[PDB]
Amino acid sequence: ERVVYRPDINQGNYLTANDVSKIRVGMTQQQVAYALGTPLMSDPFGTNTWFYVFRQQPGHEGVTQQTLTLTFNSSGVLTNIDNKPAL
């Protein structure tokens, strides 16, 4: 249970408030990758989508996750964006 010392578990990108501010709709793939770093996961299937997730599980505190989704057309320009802050 929570009482035992599990090590801190980190997952996904280190997405943070400052860098997500630079993202602008319609921006090209290379610059968004530069702004947030390379995506640590991407939609492997037909839809050209990038998934950024910032996830943390400290020793006993509850899991916290911030998920950001980026979609691009056939030419790699950001078409739609959404940023789930929690849960």
Partner: protein, 634 residues
């Protein structure tokens, strides 16, 4: 035949006397009268590190502008001698005004300022600047900047004998771990290695975590060496595929033997230990004996990870049936078995608690009268006659198990740093046959005295105590023991401590003229001072082993052969002994009778398992002790 360094000379060097300078170089002209191994063989390549040592030494005393003017090495005409002259210019020593950090701080301004802080007016030091550079590098690594650009540019204010230090730092791009790989765990399951990590794959890199992975793998003890390589992923700017390179080794011993004329008969016995059984990480240990007068057996299994959180689970089985003189009907016949189940979980990275329940069965028959056992039985309300041996006793007892272990050993099987503490304690469950509590404290402290970790001073101690909870007393069958390979070298196994005192009694199953103790058949008619050990309730054992390098064995045996001098002291005594009734016997109440022994200890991690070779003198015994100077164990 080749030339030898006949003189080392340095011109100038007004700040420090030449002898002091040459006290540090590897190249050396003369042999101290108490040393022989100081070879004077000059080599051209060897001098480079020496010159760098001079560089660093002068940089570490404030002489910033220090430089080598030139170096000339010349032969004698006969080719028998080399003179080495190093020509230097010192200049003045300079003190640091302050450190200015510039560039891309990556938002960690406070911590980087803290690392580079200095007290005012301190002398310039090359070691200080190198330490700051490396510290800032690892500080940036801790937050996921694997490869930060760091540059230290000192600015000399020669006008006032002062120096201003300019540091330029650029963190770069944070690095994420893409794919952790293990190379070399040919037998151990990949899970067994990866469970120890603290850097989870697909997360921002961490120098501290990836290093702690190596640290925990090395503590696990299943590998000879472990190497880490933060190889950058090709074709990507900020992804690194950490690789752990390992090399497995044997993880147990398989001891087997058969009886000879030194034994009651030709029969088999064995003892087996295994820490990584079939590479799954399970720990297994078995002991087995089928002597004509003893059928002792023991087994233990432990899973270090019952769940991935770290909760360890294990248990122990043991069985015993012993007879003293014969098989079918014998004196001091005892039968015993028990079951222990253990659960343990880590409370932090280094401390782990343990818990569990123990069950023990005990039976005794034809017991030889003696003071301690009958005192205990008097405690329990049994009233067995002393004059007659034809009596028996039985017990069924359950115990609560707990313990505490602190482990900071740097390596599993030949540790050189840190210490290990192990506190184990038992208490009887209420309503059980026995009402006693027992606690034992073990401590092993390793400290190196030389930076190479070949000279290590091992401070190892064990402690123990126990007492009855109610009016009863703790059971004789479970007492402490000392002596043997483990606790104290020199003495025979389980021999140290208070000594049994038999009563005069009629002997059962008697046979004329056989060796017997204190039988009215033989005419013995008084209380007995004897040489049969009985153990005791409390003990304290200490050791200081001076580990030393293997002197004349090649490096191939470096990680297998260890030798050490040692000094041993240890004691076992009974707090409950009533000295008033036994004026004519040693007073076991006082622990003042410390045993001591000293000797040489050799450890060899042979392919079949660790070998313990011990030779020692029990240079302070007490009456009734038995010892053999050289003792061996596997």
């Amino acid at each position: 035949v080749s030339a030898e360094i006949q003189q080392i000379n340095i011109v100038g060097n007004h700040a420090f006397t030449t002898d002091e300078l040459i006290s540090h170089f590897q190249l050396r002209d003369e042999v101290p009268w108490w040393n022989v191994v100081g070879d004077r063989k000059y080599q051209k390549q060897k001098l480079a590190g020496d010159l760098e040592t001079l560089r660093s030494y002068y940089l570490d005393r404030g002489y910033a502008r220090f430089n080598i003017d030139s170096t000339q090495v010349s032969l004698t005409p006969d080719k028998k001698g080399i003179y080495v002259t190093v020509n230097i210019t010192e200049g003045d020593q300079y003190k640091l005004s302050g450190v200015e950090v510039s560039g891309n701080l990556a938002g960690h301004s406070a911590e980087i300022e803290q690392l580079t802080k200095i007290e005012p007016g301190e002398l310039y030091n090359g070691t200080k600047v190198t330490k700051m550079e490396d510290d800032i590098k690892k500080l940036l690594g801790r937050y996921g900047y694997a490869y930060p650009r760091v540059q230290s540019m000192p600015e000399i204010n020669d006008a006032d004998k002062t120096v201003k230090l300019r540091v330029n730092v650029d963190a770069g791009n944070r690095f994420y771990v893409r794919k952790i790989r293990f190379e070399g765990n040919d037998t151990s399951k990949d899970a067994v290695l990866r469970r120890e990590m603290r850097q989870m794959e697909g997360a921002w890199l961490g120098s501290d975590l990836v290093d702690q992975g190596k640290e925990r793998l090395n503590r696990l003890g299943f590998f000879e060496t472990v190497d880490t390589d933060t190889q950058r992923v090709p074709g990507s700017p900020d992804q690194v595929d950490v690789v752990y390179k390992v090399k497995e080794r044997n993880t147990g011993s398989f001891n087997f033997g058969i009886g000879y004329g030194t034994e009651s008969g030709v029969s088999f016995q064995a003892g087996v230990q295994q820490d990584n059984w079939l590479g799954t990480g399970y720990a297994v240990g078995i002991n087995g004996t089928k002597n004509d007068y003893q059928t002792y057996a023991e087994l233990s299994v432990t899973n270090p990870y019952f769940t991935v959180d770290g909760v360890s689970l294990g248990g122990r089985l043991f069985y015993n049936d012993f007879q003293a003189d014969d098989a079918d009907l014998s004196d001091y016949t005892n039968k015993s078995y028990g079951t222990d189940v253990t659960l343990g979980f880590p409370i932090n990275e280094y401390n782990s608690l343990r818990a569990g329940l123990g069950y023990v069965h005990n039976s005794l028959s034809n017991m030889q009268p003696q003071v301690a056992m009958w005192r205990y039985l008097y405690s329990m309300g049994e009233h067995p006659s002393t004059s007659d041996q034809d009596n028996s006793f039985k017990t069924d007892d359950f115990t609560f198990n707990y313990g505490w272990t602190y482990n900071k050993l740097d390596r599993g099987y030949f540790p050189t740093d840190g210490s290990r503490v192990n506190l184990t304690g038992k208490v009887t469950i209420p309503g059980s046959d026995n009402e006693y509590y027992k606690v034992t404290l073990d401590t092993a402290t390793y400290v190196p005295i030389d930076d190479d970790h070949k000279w290590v001073v091992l401070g190892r101690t064990r402690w123990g105590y126990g007492d009855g909870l109610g009016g009863k007393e703790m059971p004789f069958y479970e007492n402490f023991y000392a002596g043997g390979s483990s606790t104290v070298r020199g003495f025979q196994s389980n021999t140290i401590g208070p000594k049994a005192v038999y009563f005069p009694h009629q002997a059962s199953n008697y046979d004329p003229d056989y060796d017997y103790e204190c039988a009215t058949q033989d005419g013995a008619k008084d209380l007995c001072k004897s040489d049969d050990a009985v153990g005791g309730n409390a003990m304290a054992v200490a050791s200081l082993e001076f580990i030393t390098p293997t002197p004349f064995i090649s490096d191939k045996y470096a990680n297998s052969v260890r030798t050490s001098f040692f000094w041993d002291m240890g004691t076992v005594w009974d707090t409950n002994w009533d000295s008033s009734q036994y004026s004519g016997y040693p007073d076991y109440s006082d622990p003042s009778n410390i045993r001591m022994s000293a000797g040489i200890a050799l450890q060899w991690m042979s392919p079949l398992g660790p070998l313990v070779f011990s030779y020692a003198q029990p240079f302070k015994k007490y009456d009734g002790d038995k010892a053999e100077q050289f003792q061996f164990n596997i």
